[PDB]
Amino acid sequence: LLPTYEIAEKQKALFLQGHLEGVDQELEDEIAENALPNVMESAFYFEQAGVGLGTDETYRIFLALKQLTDTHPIQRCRFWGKILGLEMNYIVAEVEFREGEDEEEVEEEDVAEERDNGESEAHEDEEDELPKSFYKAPQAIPKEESRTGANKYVYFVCNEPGRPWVKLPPVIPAQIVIARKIKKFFTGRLDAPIISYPPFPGNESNYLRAQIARISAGTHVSPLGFYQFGEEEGEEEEEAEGGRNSFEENPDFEGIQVIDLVESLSNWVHHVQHILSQGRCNWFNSIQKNEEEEEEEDEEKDDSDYIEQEVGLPLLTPISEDLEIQNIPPWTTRLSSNLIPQYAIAVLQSNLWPGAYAFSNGKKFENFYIGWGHKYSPDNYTPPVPPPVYQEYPSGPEITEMDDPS
Amino acid sequence: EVAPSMLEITIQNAKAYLLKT
Amino acid sequence: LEEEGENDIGEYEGGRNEAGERHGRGRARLPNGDTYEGSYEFGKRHGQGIYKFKNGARYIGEYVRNKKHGQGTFIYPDGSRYEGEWANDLRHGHGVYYYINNDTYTGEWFAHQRHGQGTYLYAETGSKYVGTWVNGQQEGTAELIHLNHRYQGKFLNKNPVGPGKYVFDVGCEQHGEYRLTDMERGEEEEEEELVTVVPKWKATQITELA
Amino acid sequence: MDADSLLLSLELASGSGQGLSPDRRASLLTSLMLVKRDYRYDRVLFWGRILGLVADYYIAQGLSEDQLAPRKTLYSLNCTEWSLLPPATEEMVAQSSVVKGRFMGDPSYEYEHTELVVQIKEETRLVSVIDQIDKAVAIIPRGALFKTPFGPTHVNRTFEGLSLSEAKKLSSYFHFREPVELKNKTLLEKADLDPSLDFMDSLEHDIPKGSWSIQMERGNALVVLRSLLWPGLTFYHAPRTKNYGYVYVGTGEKNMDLPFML
């Protein structure tokens, strides 16, 4: 009894058409129209690019997205890519859900916040009181809301085609900061803890979500003019602090020539919002206190508690302005075949994230990460230094023992 | 006990292979 | 505050010797608002006692001639505390400091400073710096141990230096070196330009556990 | 990764996603058998692809009658024009060890390093990177080669492929080079090994431990061994057949963060 047969009996669930003898054709018409990506055409174009999986694995994920789209009410889907691992790889799909059908997690924070105010009552001993610590811990950077920022794109991950897909947990700004500060493999199991320095507040599923978001924020690129900002009428006075977080596909996209897409880096524009060093896509002020508390602290505000607003790159940025990795261009452009300029397609290679590739035949494009999910660095990944030891309470008169009078 | 020679080990391996059914 | 008012004695409840000085176990309220409860000798503190300061600071331990001595626990008003030996109102010997954010330092002490061998555990991360301490700065051969790994090598001014190796629990070691690299020129306000010495790891070989 | 079954090798090693274009695939298929006659090689192995910033180095090697003999390295920039490469020495590696980063893609490009200014070519860097990968993460299954008592090592014509149990074990895969740790092995360990089959160093004792991520693509009908010391390396094995081979598609940089990574 071989594991070749175990996948074979698992994948035949994909290959076999379901026994839908009694399911309405109108319901089948409403389902099988707009919920699917052209993974198969993408892999051929990435086969033109010199990357991508083989056919048989691509058609198996092409099957796996059918059962995924049939089980869940998916509005739009795209094959995000494949992140390899120690025991098994991860097959990742980037999707968008329908309105009003989201499985909202019903307030898991309501339980965690009610386990610290355990006041002890009815104990009368009014001597030897402990000096209470004035250390207010720095505020944890709040998670981004659904359909916004790094949490805008929902990701499902399956180990193999024919296996059930599993929902990735949403990503945390503390997770992204630590995921940048660490560098670990994936073990093929999402329940494996990330045992690293600094410690990751989550399992491998949270680290996979953080790595995918970091790849998406810096590799997902589109041809210039493919995507355009929506023309919202009436919001001309609210552009001071909030950037444009929405984009739409341009119906008038005639198309950039492949030779222009290769010779010029500026014809490729990113289509996913950048993740800040705070760990968000939109900056949050951790010092913004309540208005009822600000009215009494306006006379002793020091100049050491200001946090500079982390402003990242906006939407639709050319890849030529991405940071050069020690005079190395962050993106590699080449033709799919140098002997033919007419049916060259614009092979784009992410030097910042090895394994991330984007094609363009002139009109169609996709982004596709097949790697290990790790950021390229010219030097070593240096583990962080131990934090500096906090300075002890100074030995002033309140620690110097007052002398004994006669 | 003297360790068996490589010639003797190959002889035992050859005898056992011919004893395979 | 150690300049005694020789005429301002303050309140005292306890025994006295033949010369009128305070002797034996007694409780004294000093004029600075501080309180003491412990044994006395010739009008001076000796033996076990508790000195509670005005702002919330408090020492529990032994005293020798108006000076803290022996084993003692001082709980500072910021919520931090120290438990260990004392000598002439100074942190001395082996002792444990619990910091303001549950950080735990355990090791030797010398003149209110971290000295000798010491283990500093960061509460937020869980990493422990085990090694030699010189004037409260990371120095000498030391181990930064965190979870599944430990770096074994040298430190200098909280910036680890020189050759070293990382030992992981999976069965491997990574031999390399730390190079003190000075590329961060702070554009901050013009106050005491701090050379932010950034140590960079440069590995040379990877070995198994022998 | 034989040239005769290069198309099958590329289709099976495409599970790592780092395939090749049909332009480069058919150019490789034709050019390896051209290099095979032009230098009179017994067998030709496609080494893989070293990615660059402008062009990609396509590397392949040729072998003599002795399978353990030093092989001859050739490289290309468009899978058509193949140029030979010089062998590496100790001074060759010691110079090239100080260069870090990705390859530019131009063989005449030169890297400058300050020693306490040494000029180090990219073709100089390419040769050492190829030889460092060849000495470290080369894989051959057990029983693929047999060593005659006369000294030369030949391809075992009776090799039917590894079994299903042996394909899941790291000890059944051996380094495709001369033994190093086998000489340091004791006589008691030498008594249990076949001199004609176990004459190489096994991947079980590879330094560091856990450097191989062995995986079951299509359920161990294809056995995929991905190197963790060198990212982008994928070795495919099909049990009960003669299909085997390894391909490196990457930047040619060692993962010396591997203790940090595991």
UniProtKB/Swiss-Prot annotation, chain A:
Transmembrane segments: none annotated. Residues 99-113, 230-240 have a biased composition (Acidic residues). The modification Phosphoserine is found at S120. It comes from the Eukaryota. Coiled coil: none annotated. Expressed in trachea, lungs, and testes. Very strong expression is detected in nasal brushings. Interacts with RSPH6A. It is linked to Ciliary dyskinesia, primary, 11: A disorder characterized by abnormalities of motile cilia. Respiratory infections leading to chronic inflammation and bronchiectasis are recurrent, due to defects in the respiratory cilia; reduced fertility is often observed in male patients due to abnormalities of sperm tails. Half of the patients exhibit situs inversus, due to dysfunction of monocilia at the embryonic node and randomization of left-right body asymmetry. Primary ciliary dyskinesia associated with situs inversus is referred to as Kartagener syndrome. Component of the axonemal radial spoke head which plays an important role in ciliary motility. Essential for triplet radial spokes (RS1, RS2 and RS3) head assembly in the motile cilia. This is Radial spoke head protein 4 homolog A. It comes from Homo sapiens (Human). The gene is RSPH4A. The chain holds residues 277 to 682 of 716 of the full protein.
Swiss-Prot record, chain C:
GO terms for cellular component: condensed nuclear chromosome; cytosol; meiotic spindle; motile cilium; nucleus; outer dense fiber; radial spoke head; radial spoke head 1. Residues 1-34 are annotated as: Disordered. The keyword rRNA processing does not apply. Disulfide bonds: none annotated. It is found in: Cytoplasm; Chromosome; Cytoplasm, Cytoskeleton, Cilium axoneme; Cytoplasm, Cytoskeleton, Flagellum axoneme. Keywords: Cell projection, Chromosome, Ciliopathy, Cilium, Cytoplasm, Cytoskeleton, Disease variant, Flagellum, Meiosis, Primary ciliary dyskinesia, Repeat. Residues 13-23 have a biased composition (Basic and acidic residues). Its main location: cytoplasm. Expressed in trachea, lungs, airway brushings, and testes. It is linked to Ciliary dyskinesia, primary, 24: A disorder characterized by abnormalities of motile cilia. Respiratory infections leading to chronic inflammation and bronchiectasis are recurrent, due to defects in the respiratory cilia. Situs inversus is not observed in CILD24 patients. Component of the axonemal radial spoke 1 (RS1) and 2 (RS2) complexes, at least composed of spoke head proteins RSPH1, RSPH3, RSPH9 and the cilia-specific component RSPH4A or sperm-specific component RSPH6A, spoke stalk proteins RSPH14, DNAJB13, DYDC1, ROPN1L and NME5, and the RS1 complex-specific anchor protein IQUB. Interacts with RSPH3B. Interacts with RSPH4A. Interacts with RSPH6A. This is Radial spoke head 1 homolog. It comes from Homo sapiens (Human). The gene is RSPH1. The chain holds residues 9 to 218 of 309 of the full protein.
From Swiss-Prot, chain D:
It is found in: Cytoplasm, Cytoskeleton, Cilium axoneme; Cytoplasm, Cytoskeleton, Flagellum axoneme; Cell projection, Kinocilium. Keywords: Cell projection, Ciliopathy, Cilium, Cilium biogenesis/degradation, Cytoplasm, Cytoskeleton, Disease variant, Flagellum, Kartagener syndrome, Primary ciliary dyskinesia. GO terms for biological process: axonemal central apparatus assembly; axoneme assembly; cilium movement; cilium movement involved in cell motility; motile cilium assembly; radial spoke assembly. The keyword Cytoplasm applies. InterPro entries: RSP9. Component of the axonemal radial spoke 1 (RS1) and 2 (RS2) complexes, at least composed of spoke head proteins RSPH1, RSPH3, RSPH9 and the cilia-specific component RSPH4A or sperm-specific component RSPH6A, spoke stalk proteins RSPH14, DNAJB13, DYDC1, ROPN1L and NME5, and the RS1 complex-specific anchor protein IQUB. Interacts with IQUB. Interacts with RSPH3B. Interacts with RSPH4A. Interacts with RSPH6A. Interacts with CFAP61. Interacts with LRRC23. Functions as part of axonemal radial spoke complexes that play an important part in the motility of sperm and cilia. Essential for both the radial spoke head assembly and the central pair microtubule stability in ependymal motile cilia. Required for motility of olfactory and neural cilia and for the structural integrity of ciliary axonemes in both 9+0 and 9+2 motile cilia. This is Radial spoke head protein 9 homolog. It comes from Homo sapiens. The gene is RSPH9.
